[PDB]
Write a structure and sequence with these properties.
Elements: E1 19-22, E2 41-48, E3 51-56, E4 62-66, E5 70-73
Antiparallel strand pairs: 1-2, 1-5, 2-3, 3-4
Length: 79
């Protein structure tokens, strides 16, 4: 039972990160299981040319998907 200790949050609590909304679940159900279902929001972890790394704020799965498969989110509407 790891004891450890609770410290400060990782979030930059100042600079917002780039989010990418899954335009279409990927990969396809014919090649592999989709790590980020459509409509799912993901946080931009790293940018590598046309392909970047992101993680789902719902499941917390780290995977690499093509920007085309996702959409650069700007912000909410109802608040």
């Amino acid at each position: 039972g790891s004891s450890g200790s609770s410290g400060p949050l990782p979030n930059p609590e100042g600079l917002d990160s780039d989010f990418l909304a899954v335009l279409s679940d990927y990969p396809s159900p014919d090649i592999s299981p989709p790590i980020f279902r459509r409509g799912e929001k993901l946080r931009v972890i790293s940018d590598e040319g046309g392909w970047w790394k992101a993680i789902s704020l719902s499941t917390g799965r780290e995977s690499y998907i093509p920007g085309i498969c996702v959409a650069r989110v700007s912000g909410p509407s109802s608040g």
